Each structure stands twice: as structure tokens, then as C-alpha cells.
């Protein structure tokens, strides 16, 4: 009775990894604090063939590093359990990244009634790698910690450095930006990291709304940015997009 | 740190001010934890059943 709970208490690290390998069926991501402690992860960070600021960087981000590393079971016996922990190795570090959010943009004019209302399909993460931009279209391969962006180049596309002209022009003659088109006006809001883009065209009525001051703005026929420190909700037609994270009551 | 610009010419907001860490390769590590064995029978049978079920996965 005491020895079974002693077996539980000495082997906390061993029963949890067998459970975590059963549930994920051999291949486990993200790696846990049972699969690898912080001291062992730090001593392994000091071991990798990388420069010193890379080691400091993975020491400051020991949560995102765990969220990018797999751990594949290799050999299990009655008294030994073995698994390869595939810790990430970053090739380049400390080069500027940026996340591109887009929104529908109708070329509204009442002179003729000819609107085409583009949208850019190349939203996602971009980083500088080797003098050329490495672009990540998936929203799951890149993880952010408050100034830092961590991606992977497994299936990442590699675009030239002249894709920044995609931010101010679609038909710029230096890169062909990914664009889908329409033929009638559409209206939706795209919440961003530090704000929200609101496109309001046609007969749609979109009103911004501060948390305390009520309606403070009425969007015209046009695409307008609005910060997450100036408004709190945006109503487009009947959809109430929430620009900020709505605070709620706590629990105990 | 993060500055988010907005370009109304394409209706896109760009969140600049980040610093990269682009994964390029792997770093394997063979971690081998040994069983803290015990000489109660049902717990050992449960652990050996788990070990057998994980062995048949390969």
C-alpha cells in the first residue's frame, strides 16, 4: 500500500511519459516538462552548434521551443524507456519579421457602378532569412512571444525581398502578389494583432463602438483601420466583431 | 516594440517590429530514463501491460 504509492512518487517522470506516448501513439508534440526538464533543456541548449545569442534566445523562450519540438519513442523495454527529442535548431536569428493581415478592398465609385473588390490571399508571416524573404502561409507553424517570432522552414515558401511592395500595390512590377477578385461589394472586418481593419461598402452599416462611450464612429464606403486602444467592438451589418478581448468575471 | 502600420491602398495591416528564429534543422537527443524497479502486483502488471502495448506499437 505504501510501496505502490512510492512507485508512483519516484516514477512521476516515467508514468507520465508512457501515458503521453500512449495518448499520442508514439509521436508526441509539444514536448512536456516531464519529457524534458528546464535544466536538461538548458544544458542541451548550451550544447548545440549555434552561436551564443542563439543559446540565450532559446534560453529565454523555453516554452515556444517546447512547442516546436517533437519526441519520438525509439526503444522501450521492461526497465528502460528511450525516445529521441527533436529539439529545434534555428539557422538564422534576429532578422525582422512581420505578419500581413489583409481585408477586402472595393474600388467604390458612383461614377459608373464598376467595382471589383480585391482581396489578398497571401496573409501570413514573413521573415528575413538570407537576403530573401521566407514566407509562411500557415497560421500554425509560427509562434509569437511578445517581440519574438519562431517559425520553421519545412514547407515554407521563399520569396524575394521585393514583396514589401505588395503592401502598397498589388500590380507592382517587382512581385506578383496573390490576389482573388470579386465583382460585387462585400463587407467584413478582420481583427489584427493590435487593432482591426474594417471594410464597409454597399448598403452595409458598420459602426465602431468603444466599451464605455458607445458608438464613436460610423464607417463610410471605404476601408478603415482602427486601433485596439480606441474602440472595442465593430458592427458590420449584423456581425459584431470584437476588436479587443472582452474581459469577463473571474472564478475560484 | 511592435508597430502596426496600415496601408489603405491595398487595405492591409502589417505588424512590424519582430525578430526571427527560423528553424532549419533538428537536434536529436536519446533520453533514457530507467525504471525505479520494485520487488503491489497489480501496479507492476499495469506497468508491464503498458510497456507491452507500447512495444507492439513498433
Amino acid at each position, epitope marked *: 500500500i505504501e510501496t505502490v504509492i512510492e512507485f508512483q512518487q519516484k516514477n512521476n517522470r516515467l508514468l507520465e511519459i508512457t501515458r503521453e506516448f500512449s495518448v499520442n501513439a508514439g509521436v508526441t508534440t509539444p514536448v512536456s516538462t516531464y519529457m524534458l526538464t528546464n535544466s536538461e533543456l538548458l544544458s542541451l541548449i548550451n550544447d548545440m552548434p549555434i552561436t551564443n545569442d542563439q543559446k540565450k534566445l532559446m534560453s529565454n523562450n523555453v516554452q515556444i521551443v517546447r512547442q516546436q519540438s517533437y519526441s519520438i519513442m525509439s526503444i522501450i523495454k521492461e526497465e528502460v524507456l528511450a525516445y529521441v527529442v527533436q529539439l529545434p535548431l534555428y539557422g538564422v536569428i534576429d532578422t525582422p519579421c512581420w505578419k500581413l493581415h489583409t481585408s477586402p478592398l472595393c474600388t467604390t465609385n458612383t461614377k459608373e457602378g464598376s467595382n471589383i473588390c480585391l482581396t489578398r490571399t497571401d496573409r501570413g508571416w514573413y521573415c528575413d532569412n538570407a537576403g530573401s524573404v521566407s514566407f509562411f502561409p500557415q497560421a500554425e507553424t509560427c509562434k509569437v512571444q511578445s517581440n519574438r517570432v519562431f517559425c520553421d522552414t519545412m514547407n515554407s515558401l521563399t520569396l524575394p525581398s521585393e514583396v514589401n511592395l505588395c503592401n*502598397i500595390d498589388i*500590380f507592382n512590377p517587382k512581385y506578383d502578389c496573390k490576389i482573388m477578385t470579386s465583382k460585387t461589394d462585400v463587407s467584413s472586418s478582420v481583427i489584427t494583432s493590435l487593432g482591426a481593419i474594417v471594410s464597409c461598402y454597399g448598403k452595409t452599416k458598420c459602426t465602431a463602438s468603444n466599451k464605455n462611450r458607445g458608438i464613436i464612429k460610423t464607417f463610410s464606403n471605404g476601408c478603415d483601420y482602427v486601433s485596439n486602444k480606441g474602440v472595442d467592438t465593430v458592427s458590420v451589418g449584423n456581425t459584431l466583431y470584437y476588436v479587443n478581448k472582452q474581459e469577463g468575471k473571474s472564478l475560484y | 516594440n511592435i508597430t502596426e502600420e496600415f496601408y489603405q491602398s491595398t487595405c492591409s495591416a502589417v505588424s512590424k517590429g519582430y525578430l526571427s528564429a527560423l528553424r532549419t534543422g533538428w537536434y536529436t537527443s536519446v533520453i533514457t530514463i530507467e525504471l525505479s524497479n520494485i520487488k503491489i502486483k497489480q501496479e507492476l502488471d499495469k506497468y508491464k501491460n503498458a510497456v507491452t502495448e507500447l512495444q507492439l506499437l513498433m
Partner: antibody
Amino acid sequence: EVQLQQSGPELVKPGASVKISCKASGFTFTDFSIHWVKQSQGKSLDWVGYIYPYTGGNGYNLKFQSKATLTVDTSSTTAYMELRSLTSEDSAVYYCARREGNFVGAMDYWGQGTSVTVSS
Amino acid sequence: DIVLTQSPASLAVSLGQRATISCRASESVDNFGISFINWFQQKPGQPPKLLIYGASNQGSGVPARFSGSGSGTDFSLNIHPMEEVDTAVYFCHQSKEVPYTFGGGTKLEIK
């Protein structure tokens, strides 16, 4: 409103690299593209090149690549045109265009026109 | 290189009538359904000024007498009614891809 000043007419000896300055006041300089258009003496509006001042990105028509070097100064909101190895065929007028793109309203308002007279 | 042919060369239109100018592109300048043709007007001693953009729309502060029409490889600029102040050279500029090409331009002096 949006206005584009340009440098005065220059009278230059051949073979000298000259600089045309186009000052833009009244809009956001990192949202448009200052195109350069050369009109000769009584002919059409021959295109020269483009500069997007958001990145300083330059491109050319493929008969002005060995002739023009188009630069920006985004802090002074100014476009510059460096003309190298000038001949009698470059005595013309040059225009800077604000050139809203992306399902365009293209070339809204223009510069007043720099007249470069190249002769001995 | 999308070369554009603009017709005619010199256009004589009576005071108070309809004047049309054709611009035939050699390739399709349409991009995702809408054309990229801009019609400019240049008085002598003056920079060219936008009149028509997108081959249909009207520029900021342009009276309705100027109108764009057409699609594909054929476009038309229509000026009606005609005044004494609208004497200039007009240009049809393509905007699809590099290099951008300007038409030869029509000089309309009043008949």
C-alpha cells in the same frame, strides 16, 4: 492639396550626369509610386521608370536602364533622377507622377516638368 | 511590351458636338475583369492631368462630358458636349504590366 514641385530648366554640356529633383507635398509618400515620364520635343509620353518610395524600389523601361538612376529621399519626401552620359537625344521634359496603383486611379497629379537642354 | 495604337492623329470637332478617340491595345490589358486604361489631357505648357481611370470611371474634379468605354483590346474616350476650352492632346496609358505604354495622343483643335 497634393502638389509636385520640380527643378527648373537646366542647360548642360553633353556627357554630364545631372540630377532632377521632384518635391512631393500633400500625401502619404509610402503609399504611392513616383513614376518618371520623358516627353521629347513634340513626341509622345515615353516611359522611363518607376520608384516605389516605400522601399525605394526602382525599375526601368529597357532602354533607360543604362541611362537613368532613380532614387528617393523619403525623409524630405523628394524623388531624384540621375541622368548619366547625356546626349542630344535627352534634351526633353521630364515629369514625376504620383500614380495611385492597385485597380488604379493612375497618375492623379503631375510635376510641373523639368526641361533638360543638352548641347555644347 | 503592350503597344497601343491611338486613333486619330488630329481631330476636328465642331463646337458643341461629340468627339470620339479610339485606343486599340495589342494585348489584353484586362486584369481580373477590369481594364487598366487611363486617359490623360495635356494642354501646351502644362503637365498631363488624369481624366479617365479604369477605362470607365471619372477622375476627381472631372466633368461628366468625358466618358470612357470599351473593354478587351478596344477602348474609347468620348467628349460630349464640346467647348472651346477642351483643346489639348489626349493619351491612353496602359497599366497592366511593365513597361507601361502611352498612346500617341490625339490633338483636338476645334473645327
